[PDB]
């Protein structure tokens, strides 16, 4: 069937700026295109149909064009309600089919992540358990990777990684990684390293810690 | 004022099956047709299927048809998708939308809030609330970052807070991942230096579905 594409999946912009959205068609599918707007709380809200047609109480500076294979979302002008998420949807053939979205995010300054890194608490360990516990805090843009060490090479079996969404008073992101082990794996090795590679910088942040030094 | 209310959330198991609602209000019920979205956190929106309320007729997406049953209630206004053999793969978000037509061409112009289904065998279970201290061989600085590892608790929501709200800023309550059947989450504060360990620093999480309340505070660590 009919696979829809949007080349950018994350988009940076300021208030005002003139932000346009784009969406890719696998065929032709002859206007048959519409656009949903889905905020953070899940709540989703239709923008515009047939390509150019603007549903009722949408403000005027959401505009759609497009023809044949590839189209776009154009928003003047850009407000602060405007941030969220953008999908394009073909009726053309069946199944209906969306593009992957666009999540807007707002425009800053450079930040290179505060990390900090935590061993096992003593409630844990008694329970039979060990995490190793890492966040990355206050940095922007939002791609970053972190990468675990045991004993100086590299873990990633019961690595779990979670995402703040853009903050929205000073617009940083902040990450957590948490390394789980059992009680008995974690006290066979010594050093456990949290790097974060982020375009800050070319040298990674490291943070660790040794057990023979607790 | 067009409106689709979708019944709550939803915890099964896998295997079993499920049957979720979307009541109409507002408009002519079988005018419309009803189309179902599914939304899961990392591939953006499939189209299940949609019915047509008037006649009952149903038009499904191939890889939903196996699993998917669409129906309604033209006395009450409220269409209904089933979901069978349920699997970790159908914990999802769940839409309904109404469709208009124009040109030939059909367009969701108003959509449900959504239902959330999570397929687990998992029951209500309280956090296990983890103090994060930083290391003993640690040398911190002006600024010390403490955390709270809220580990093994089902099912969502739960709240975090510092010192019962009276640490607002440097504050990072983490969205919650998936460990085995379970959630767990982190939430960091920072704080100068002279606020901790000379002062108490506790976190307090609220676990509702379990009526839990634990208040847990960060002490330096013992050495050796």
């Known amino acids: 069937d009919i696979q829809m594409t949007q080349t950018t999946s994350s988009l940076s912009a300021s208030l005002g700026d003139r932000v346009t959205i784009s969406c890719r068609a696998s065929?032709?599918?002859?206007?048959?295109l519409n656009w949903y707007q889905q905020k953070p709380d899940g709540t989703v809200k239709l923008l515009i149909y047939?390509?150019?047609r603007l549903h009722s109480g949408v403000p005027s500076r959401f505009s759609g064009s497009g023809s044949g294979t590839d189209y776009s979302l154009t928003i003047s002008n850009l407000e602060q309600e405007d941030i969220a998420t953008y999908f394009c949807q073909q009726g053309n053939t069946l199944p209906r089919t969306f593009g992957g979205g666009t999540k807007l995010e707002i425009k800053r300054a450079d930040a290179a992540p505060t990390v900090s890194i935590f061993p096992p608490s003593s409630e844990q360990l008694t329970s039979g358990g060990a995490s190793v516990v890492c966040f990355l805090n206050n940095f922007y843009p939002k791609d970053i990777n972190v990468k675990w060490k045991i004993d100086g090479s590299e873990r990633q079996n019961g690595v779990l990684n979670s995402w703040t969404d853009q903050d929205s008073k000073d617009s940083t992101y902040s990450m957590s990684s948490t390394l789980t082990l059992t009680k008995d794996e974690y006290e066979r090795h010594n050093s456990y390293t949290c790097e974060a590679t982020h375009k800050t910088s070319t040298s990674p942040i490291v943070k660790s810690f040794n057990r023979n030094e607790c | 004022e067009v409106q689709l209310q979708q019944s709550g959330a939803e915890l099964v198991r896998a295997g079993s099956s499920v049957k979720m609602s979307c009541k109409a209000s507002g408009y002519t019920f079988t005018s419309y047709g009803i189309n179902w979205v599914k939304q899961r956190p990392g591939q953006g929106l499939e189209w299940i299927g949609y019915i047509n309320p008037g006649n009952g007729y149903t038009k499904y997406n191939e890889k939903f048809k196996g699993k998917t049953t669409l129906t309604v209630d033209k006395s009450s206004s409220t269409a209904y998708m089933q979901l069978r053999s349920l699997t970790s793969e159908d914990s999802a978000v769940y839409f309904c939308?109404?469709?208009?037509?124009?040109?030939?061409?059909?367009?969701?112009?108003?959509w449900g809030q959504g239902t959330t289904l999570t397929v687990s065998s998992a029951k209500t279970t309280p956090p296990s609330v983890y103090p994060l201290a930083p290391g003993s061989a640690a040398q911190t600085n002006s600024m010390v970052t403490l955390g709270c590892l809220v580990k093994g608790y089902f099912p969502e929501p739960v709240t975090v807070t510092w010192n019962s709200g009276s640490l607002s800023s440097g504050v990072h309550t983490f969205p919650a991942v998936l460990q085995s059947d379970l959630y767990t989450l982190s939430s960091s504060v920072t704080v100068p230096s002279s606020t901790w360990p000379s002062e108490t620093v506790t976190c307090n999480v609220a676990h509702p579905a379990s009526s839990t309340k634990v208040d847990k505070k960060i002490v330096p660590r013992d050495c050796g």
């Open positions: 065929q032709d599918i002859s206007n048959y």
């Open positions: 939308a109404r469709s208009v037509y124009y040109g030939g061409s059909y367009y969701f112009d108003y």
């Open positions: 047939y390509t150019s």
